[PDB]
Every structure is written in structure tokens, then in C-alpha cells.
Design a protein around this ligand. Structure first.
Ligand SMILES: Cc1cccc(C(CC[C@H](N)C(=O)O)(c2ccccc2)c2ccccc2)c1
Ligand SMILES: Nc1ncnc2c1ncn2[C@@H]1O[C@H](COP(=O)(O)OP(=O)(O)O)[C@@H](O)[C@H]1O
Ligand SMILES: [Mg+2]
Length: 336
């Protein structure tokens, strides 16, 4: 039942080293604990310690995250589940790095072989391996929207202006899901179509950041992957199983209509752990989209990102307290 929650702590950055930052985070992958040093100069012994499903310290690499977190989820997508992974944390702590990753400088690497590639690129590659050897005819379609100030933007649309808005409506073929009217879904025929599609999306995203104040930290980003697989049974009946993967990069947790989605996510989580009736899904775009992933038939994970520095203490505790709280959400996962 319960949603899986894991924590990643990023290494120091150069500004932090320049400022003589001290660490206040200790990860123990084996005991699965994060432990925060909380007493500054006054109490050297003080700590807060939390247990998670998995933990990744400052030295963890993108391959590691992928191997430990995603391969398991990928398999269940391939058996025809819906899964969602998403990233939660204060701006600057590695949500985008974790979910998308970055390109290594000077085209030193092919995109499939980049050690900085995040979950999204690695996953699309992986989907073509696991599935070609297998034969089993399959199609893959991707989508990429952003929520900003409760407006919806389509990063993969042929339309040349990012500012053109999507709309959502209740799926009548699913009591817990939404249809995004206007959303471009692109068929991806081989692993060699991938980079160009991404690159398009990245450029459309660069423009948007210049149109909208604080775009990169105030927006939520929803990448989806849909898979259709043909299976003939032992009888010879030809049945098609469908699996979906949503990859969410949330707005910075530090914020808190500009904030409606982050707020309502908070409340939705609360109403679930405190077994309240009438969870407020309807009250935001994000939560209408994520509704099946919090409480519903989708299998969900959450990556809490944090910074190791003494300066970010209050936000770091904040992220851990909120993440740990979410371990108490139980979904009823089910195939399609
Ligand atoms: C839309 C997207 C999803 C996942 C990764 C990427 C990256 C990084 C996107 C960057 N994080 C951003 O937010 O703009 C990219 C694609 C194409 C050209 C350059 C970079 C990418 C793809 C594969 C390997 C590394 C980075 C872009
Ligand atoms: N796990 C990590 N390992 C190495 N560098 C990281 C890691 N996470 C983040 N960084 C660096 O810190 C910066 C902020 O990461 P980013 O993904 O933009 O965080 P967010 O999207 O949460 O604001 C980037 O320069 C990124 O390269
Ligand atoms: Mg970001």
C-alpha cells in the first residue's frame, strides 16, 4: 500500500565552499536514516533523525539513483501499472538535477552515456532496451507540460509560442484522472528520436523563463510516458496492456494563484494522513493531475531533496518532516 519515500542530499556547491559552510547532514544508507545536527554553537550533541525507505548521501551518483529507485518502478510500468515519481525540496537542492539531469560540458559525452543524465533521459533509453529484446510489439508516447500560476503550458507542442494555454477536464473513462485538452503527445519510434524531442522542450522552456517572473522555481513540471504493449496469451488471444509513468519536478518547497498547487498539495497530503473526509483534489491543477497518485490506484515514490549546509537548516528540517509524514499515505495500486 504505502508510498515509497527516499531522500537525496546533494554535495556542497562552490558558493558554499567559498563561505566555509559546515555540514549538518549525515546519511546512513544501511540503517536508512538521515540525521540532522540542529544545535549549532549552543548544543553540539543535538540531533534530529528520521527513517526513510532509502537514503542517498552527497556522494550518490545519477546511475545509483536510477538503479536503486527507478528500475524497480520501470518493471511495474512494464507489467502495466501507472507509476509516479516526484521530487520535493527547496529550490537549489537537486529536483531538476535528479529528474532530468544535465549535459556534461563540451559534448564530452553522448547523451545515453552522460553520467549527469537524470531519471527522464535514462528511462527513455532504458525503455528501448528492456523492450526490443523481447520482440513484443510496443509503442511509446511522451508528453511534457508545466504548471505555472495555475496555467498550463505545453513544452512539446508544434506551436511556436509557449504562452498558449492547455485546459483540463474530468476523464469520464476514469473517476480519478484528468484529460488535458490540447496536449501534444509525441510518438517515439526509436531511441534515436529522443534527444531532438527533449531539445525542443528545453528550448521552449528557456523562452518561458524569460517571459515569466521566477519561472524555474515557481513552476511544476510534469513529464509523462505512455506505453502500449501487445501480448498474445497461451490460447492465442491478443490483449494490449498499458503502463504510464509520470515524472514530476515540483516547485521549490520554500514558496509558502502563484502558489495554489504547492499549498493544496500540502493540504491533500494532510487530509490523507489524518484520514480526513473530502480531500481537496479539485482545488488545484497539480492535485487534479496527481489525484490518482496520492490515495488512488497509482504506485508512487517521492524523492525529497536537501542541501547539506548549516545555513539551510530550517528548510532542510522542513523537507524531512514533510517527506517523512508522507510515508503514511496508502495507495491501492492496480493494473489497467
Ligand atoms: C526536457 C528534458 C528532460 C530531461 C532531460 C533534458 C536535458 C537536460 C535539461 C535541463 N536539465 C533543463 O532543465 O533545461 C537536455 C535535453 C536536450 C538538450 C539539453 C539538455 C538532458 C537530456 C539528457 C541528458 C542530460 C540532460 C531535457
Ligand atoms: N545530486 C547532485 N550532485 C551534484 N550536483 C548537484 C546535485 N543536485 C544539484 N546539484 C547542482 O546544484 C544546482 C541546483 O540543482 P537543481 O536541480 O537546479 O535544483 P532545483 O531544481 O531543486 O532548484 C545545479 O547546479 C546542480 O548541478
Ligand atoms: Mg528546478
Amino acid at each position: 500500500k504505502n508510498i515509497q519515500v527516499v531522500v537525496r542530499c546533494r554535495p556542497f556547491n562552490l558558493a558554499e565552499r567559498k563561505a566555509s559552510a559546515h555540514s549538518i547532514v549525515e546519511c546512513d544508507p544501511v540503517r536508512k536514516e538521515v540525521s540532522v545536527r540542529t544545535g549549532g554553537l549552543a548544543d553540539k550533541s543535538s540531533r534530529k533523525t528520521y527513517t526513510f525507505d532509502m537514503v542517498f548521501g552527497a556522494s550518490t551518483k545519477q546511475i545509483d539513483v536510477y538503479r536503486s529507485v527507478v528500475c524497480p518502478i520501470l518493471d511495474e510500468v512494464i507489467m502495466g501499472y501507472n507509476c509516479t515519481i516526484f521530487a520535493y525540496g527547496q529550490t537549489g537542492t537537486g529536483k531538476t538535477f535528479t529528474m532530468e539531469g544535465e549535459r556534461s560540458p563540451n559534448e564530452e559525452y553522448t547523451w545515453e552515456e552522460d553520467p549527469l543524465a537524470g531519471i527522464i533521459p535514462r528511462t527513455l533509453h532504458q525503455i528501448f532496451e528492456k523492450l526490443t529484446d523481447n520482440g513484443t510489439e510496443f509503442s511509446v508516447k511522451v508528453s511534457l507540460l508545466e504548471i505555472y500560476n495555475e496555467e498550463l503550458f505545453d513544452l512539446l507542442n508544434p506551436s511556436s509560442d509557449v504562452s498558449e494555454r492547455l485546459q483540463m477536464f474530468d476523464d469520464p473513462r476514469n473517476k480519478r484522472g484528468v484529460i488535458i485538452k490540447g496536449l501534444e503527445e509525441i510518438t517515439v519510434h526509436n531511441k534515436d528520436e529522443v534527444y531532438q524531442i527533449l531539445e525542443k522542450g528545453a528550448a521552449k522552456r528557456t523562452t518561458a523563463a524569460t517571459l515569466m517572473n521566477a519561472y524555474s522555481s515557481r513552476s511544476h513540471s510534469v513529464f509523462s510516458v505512455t506505453i502500449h504493449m501487445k501480448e498474445t496469451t497461451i490460447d492465442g488471444e491478443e490483449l494490449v496492456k498499458i503502463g504510464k509513468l509520470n515524472l514530476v519536478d515540483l516547485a521549490g518547497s520554500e514558496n509558502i494563484n502563484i502558489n495554489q498547487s504547492l499549498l493544496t498539495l500540502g493540504r491533500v497530503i494532510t487530509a490523507l494522513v489524518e484520514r480526513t473526509p473530502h480531500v481537496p483534489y479539485r482545488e488545484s491543477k497539480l492535485t487534479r493531475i496527481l489525484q490518482d497518485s496520492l490515495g488512488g490506484r497509482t504506485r508512487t515514490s517521492i524523492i525529497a531533496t536537501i542541501s547539506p549546509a548549516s545555513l539551510n537548516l530550517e528548510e532542510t528540517l522542513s523537507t524531512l518532516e514533510y517527506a517523512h509524514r508522507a510515508k503514511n499515505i496508502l495507495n491501492k495500486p492496480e493494473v489497467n
